[PDB]
Amino acid sequence: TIQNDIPDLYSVFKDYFPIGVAVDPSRLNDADPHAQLTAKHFNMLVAENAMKPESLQPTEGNFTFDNADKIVDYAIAHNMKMRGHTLLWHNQVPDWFFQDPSDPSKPASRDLLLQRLRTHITTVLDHFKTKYGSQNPIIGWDVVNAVLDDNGNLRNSKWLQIIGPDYIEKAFEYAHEADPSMKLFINDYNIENNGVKTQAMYDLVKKLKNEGVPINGIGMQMHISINSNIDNIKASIEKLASLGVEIQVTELDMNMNGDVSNDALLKQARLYKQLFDLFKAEKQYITAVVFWGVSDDVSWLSKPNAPLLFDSKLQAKPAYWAIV
Numbered sequence: 001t002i003q004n005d006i007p008d009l010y011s012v013f014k015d016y017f018p019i020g021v022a023v024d025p026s027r028l029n030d031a032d033p034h035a036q037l038t039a040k041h042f043n044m045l046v047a048e049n050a051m052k053p054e055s056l057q058p059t060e061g062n063f064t065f066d067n068a069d070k071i072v073d074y075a076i077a078h079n080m081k082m083r084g085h086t087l088l089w090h091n092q093v094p095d096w097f098f099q100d101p102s103d104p105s106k107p108a109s110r111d112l113l114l115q116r117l118r119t120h121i122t123t124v125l126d127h128f129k130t131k132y133g134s135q136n137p138i139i140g141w142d143v144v145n146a147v148l149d150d151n152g153n154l155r156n157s158k159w160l161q162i163i164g165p166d167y168i169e170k171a172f173e174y175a176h177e178a179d180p181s182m183k184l185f186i187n188d189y190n191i192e193n194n195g196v197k198t199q200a201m202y203d204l205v206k207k208l209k210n211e212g213v214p215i216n217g218i219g220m221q222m223h224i225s226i227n228s229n230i231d232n233i234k235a236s237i238e239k240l241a242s243l244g245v246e247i248q249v250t251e252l253d254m255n256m257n258g259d260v261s262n263d264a265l266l267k268q269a270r271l272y273k274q275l276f277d278l279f280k281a282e283k284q285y286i287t288a289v290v291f292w293g294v295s296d297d298v299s300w301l302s303k304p305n306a307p308l309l310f311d312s313k314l315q316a317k318p319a320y321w322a323i324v
């Protein structure tokens, strides 16, 4: 059961940015304590999985929006904004996209994969616009997700193999044509470490924006660890922000590296407090901070872990009190 009278987390950040959370459609019932935590603490929602490509078009032309729409309906009922995650990724994308349908042993061509990408993006955005209209809570989408490799080169996914390097710009062109009201993000992890991947993200967005690609923001997943360096996160935000794009912290959680001891929870609280002081100091660039999961027991990280502000019994952790 949850603590009903402690401060609503997002309210602490009302003069800075919305505070959101990634959710599962099965955790939205009024009587479910995970749903109660969700509605109490967050004013922004993201689908952890229900808006991924496999979750929306499992076989070609067969769109499955029920779970996504359940999350959208809940966001509307709770006066929450949403982020759309995600139109393109190398995981949770059905194999049919990349196969020649007359010979599935062969790859789809560049033109066929681009047409499929355009149809998927346009159908997904037109679905939310036609079903929800002005009540659509989605303010923007992760148009492409994790397109860089660990060394900063373009990840050699099937999108890159079949189409080539301009598949990224094409995804943004298709999204922008389908719904110009959406803010369009490129989203990625490890770009907060101020290493070669941060520099490659800055170089890629600088290039594409100079070419007129409609990229409005960079999503910094921020799957950080208890050993992450705040100075490096601050230098990465400053570098990426110099491109004149919005920054959103999209999938925040903290990998404890197997140490869930009380001492580690106190170290986590100090690090989360430093991180949120940094986000508040960079409020001129940051337009949303979203946590990747409601509470530790539903985190995607393998066990043992304690990555979030609410523990495995849904109680506020030292980190929650340090930030509020």
Ligand SMILES: O[C@@H]1[C@@H](O)[C@H](O[C@@H]2CO[C@@H](O)[C@H](O)[C@H]2O)OC[C@H]1O
Binding pocket: 048, 049, 145, 146, 189, 221, 251, 300
């Ligand atoms: O439920 C799990 C999700 O939490 C997980 O979400 C991904 C985490 O890695 C990030 O790079 C991705 O952007 C994000 O979608 O996906 C796997 C799923 O089983």
